[PDB]
């Protein structure tokens, strides 16, 4: 079968800014298992009906996993914009594949506060689709060069998702996995049972 376990049952997901990229090929994938993640979870699919994914066949499948805030999950979609969409993760408009998001407040929350999840807040421009920016240089918002001091008009690009179980549903952590399929001239190999 396919390693959809090490991608959906991993202990820790990567940060949204430095999101993970996993190649999947030469495997038999049973997507129905993905319906038991939570009683109520987001399962949007673009360009393909979910009920007809165990009968089609692709060349490769790309899995991208991260953790984002609850109210920001609507930004992971083609044609959207906001903070995560253009600074951390940009989805191309000509996208086929599925996004699976579910609440994980029981696994990624600390009473003291989880500071291990980071997101970029300042960038010179927007992000091209499927691009990663892992730089950490100080950002000069104004005209005066500060050369690496966090004073006025010089903020650190990254902030932290201080997750706590006391927060509301709109601030609780959400685990997101995006599966991308594509067709090429090569024969299909990643098929359902």
């Amino acid at each position: 079968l396919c390693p959809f376990d090490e991608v959906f049952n991993a202990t820790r997901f990567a940060s949204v800014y430095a999101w993970n990229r996993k190649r999947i090929s030469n495997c038999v994938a049973d997507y129905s298992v993905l319906y038991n993640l939570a009683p109520f979870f987001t399962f949007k699919c673009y360009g393909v009906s979910p009920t007809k994914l165990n009968d089609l066949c692709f060349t490769n499948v790309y899995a991208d996993s991260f953790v984002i805030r609850g109210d920001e999950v609507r930004q992971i979609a083609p044609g959207q914009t906001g903070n995560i969409a253009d600074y951390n993760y940009k989805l191309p408009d000509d996208f086929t594949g599925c996004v699976i998001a579910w609440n994980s407040n029981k696994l990624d929350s600390k009473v003291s506060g989880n500071y291990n999840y980071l997101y970029r807040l300042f960038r010179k421009s927007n992000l091209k689709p499927f691009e990663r920016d892992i730089s950490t240089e100080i950002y000069q918002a104004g005209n005066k060069p500060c050369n690496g001091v966090a004073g006025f008009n010089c903020y650190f690009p990254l902030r932290s998702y201080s997750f706590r179980p006391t927060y509301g549903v709109g601030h609780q952590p959400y685990r997101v996995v995006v599966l991308s399929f594509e067709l090429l001239h090569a024969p299909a190999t990643v098929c359902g049972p």
Partner: antibody
Amino acid sequence: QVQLVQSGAEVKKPGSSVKVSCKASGGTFSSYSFIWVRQAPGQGLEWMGRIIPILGIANYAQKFQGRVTITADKSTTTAYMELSSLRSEDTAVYYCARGTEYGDYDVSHDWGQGTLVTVSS
Amino acid sequence: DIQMTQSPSTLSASVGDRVTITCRASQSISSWLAWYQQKPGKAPKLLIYKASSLESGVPSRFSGSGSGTEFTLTISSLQPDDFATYYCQQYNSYSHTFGQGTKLEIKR
């Protein structure tokens, strides 16, 4: 991977303050978090505080509030712990520990050799 | 504050056996727990964090398991290098408390 070096043994009077330095080498230095632990010669470990140098948040134990501070210096790539109002029950071996953004910022991955601090007359 | 208790405080074993140590928390700490092994006089070394995840470089014979307010650590094939003192540490809510510290010694 990462090598941590601590200062020498310290012998101080009760009415003083002590500054212990911890130098780290290895990897990008802005992804690390610094934790400080203490071990009395007659008992086990005890946690004091944790600093995130790059996010600028420092949190100490409730008991040691107003008595200890933990800072870091980016250019020297070091951390410092200042303990004030030393008491005869505060003699112990101090350990510098470093978490990591990818792993966890609260756990301790690499440990220093520790410094022996004795406070008496 | 959350108080941690270890059992048994004093343990005896021999080379080749399978051993286990239990660590119980006063309150719910979710699944945040870490285990360290300190030799006499040396600096402690991390073994397990997240109560299930194994730290890289540690031999695979160590295995942790637990969900809430009760956790266990197990050694399958004990070795002469495994004689040391093992400490718990939870990092849920501030003032991260350690445990008593179980010392595992040979059988005379």
